[PDB]
Structure formats: C-alpha cells, structure tokens
Amino acid sequence: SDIQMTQSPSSLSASVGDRVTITCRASQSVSSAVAWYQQKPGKAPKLLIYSASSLYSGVPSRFSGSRSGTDFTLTISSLQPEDFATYYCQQYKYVPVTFGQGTKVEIKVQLVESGGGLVQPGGSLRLSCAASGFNVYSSSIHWVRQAPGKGLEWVASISSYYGYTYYADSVKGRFTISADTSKNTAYLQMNSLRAEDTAVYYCARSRQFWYSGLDYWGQGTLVTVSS
C-alpha cells in the first residue's frame, strides 16, 4: 500500500542556542529506512541523517536523531543563525517514497538542471538535469515536487543499472523519464500537464548500490501553468 507519515509539530519557535526536537510517525513499520533533510528557504534541501541514525558527512555533530518503533525524532543541541529552516523526513523502505508535511523552525561533483517555464492545459514540457562528477550507472536519479507552501512529494525514479523506472501514483503515464548515458543526462518529459500539478521540480542523486538517501541535490527549476 502507501505509507502515510505525519510529522509534529507543524511549526515551532525556539530561542537561540537551546535544545530542540522534532518528531514524526510512520503509519506502517519502516525499519530504520528513514532520512532527515534540511531545507533553507528558497535554496534546495540537503541531507542530514541517513539510515535513521547516521549523520551524513559534513553535517555538524550538533545534530542527532533516534528511533523508537515508528516514532522517529531529531534532536538539535543549539540554535544558531545557520539553523532556522524547514526540516523534512522521508521513508524509503518500500516504494513509493513518501515525505512528511514537515516542521518550520525559527529562532524568534555537482548537478545542473533546466527546462522550466509556463505551460497550458494539455501541454508538455521537458525538464532536464545533467550530471557532473557522478556516473549514470553508479547512481540512481530521482525527481521530486515542491508545491509552494507544502512539503516535497516524490515524482519519478530512474535506475540505469537495473533498467527499471518508477512513477508516482498520481502521475501514471502522464510523463516519461529517460537517461542519456552518453551525455550523462537525465530527461523527464511532462506530457499533458494538469492544473493541479504546479510545483518547482528538483532532481537528486542516490547511490545505486546500497541506497543511502538523496545526497547530492539538484538546484531545480520552477514551472507554472496558466490558461
């Protein structure tokens, strides 16, 4: 089925330098295959915690996370001006990948992407992100929504090594994803865009062998539809 994952609180205000925690719950057992992500406003998100415990290399040790059954919590030791952001958490033990609504906290080797603009109902569009420094057979490439004011939603996944491509439920057959291994690029073709699917689209990279979250994150491009 589909795993619905609810994050609490919706938002929280905490002073600078103090303890803070954010919790989340999973409808069905996910077994330590959850990841915690950080999202500065406007900028693209980055990975914080993978495998429900470990800290991605480069993150400050001031972050930590733990699990209990299905209730998964994240702990920040202190709040600095580099901290206030929106924090997200997502499960990947079974496809489809479902994120949470998230929490907004306030104090009180790269990739390129292009192909966005305005669409008309029944129209088509070409999103394309090119990979630099990471291979197309050694990494899986995923495409994810971000509708304005709400959390991310998984869109598509391509895995060249295995030959399989996966699509989100609401978008069966609507679009197609394909990777050019010669140019090491990923193309994703919207066809017949609806009026609901209005979001900024981000493509990310994961290790094709021993999946460990969406480490290198694409900048992404904004797209909108008007009649």
Binding site: S160, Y161, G163
Partner: peptide, 9 residues
Amino acid sequence: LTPFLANNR
C-alpha cells in the same frame, strides 16, 4: 565501457 545487468537481462 561500463558493465551493467540491465542489458544482460
């Protein structure tokens, strides 16, 4: 040349 199992299905 890259070896991969998708083509050798």
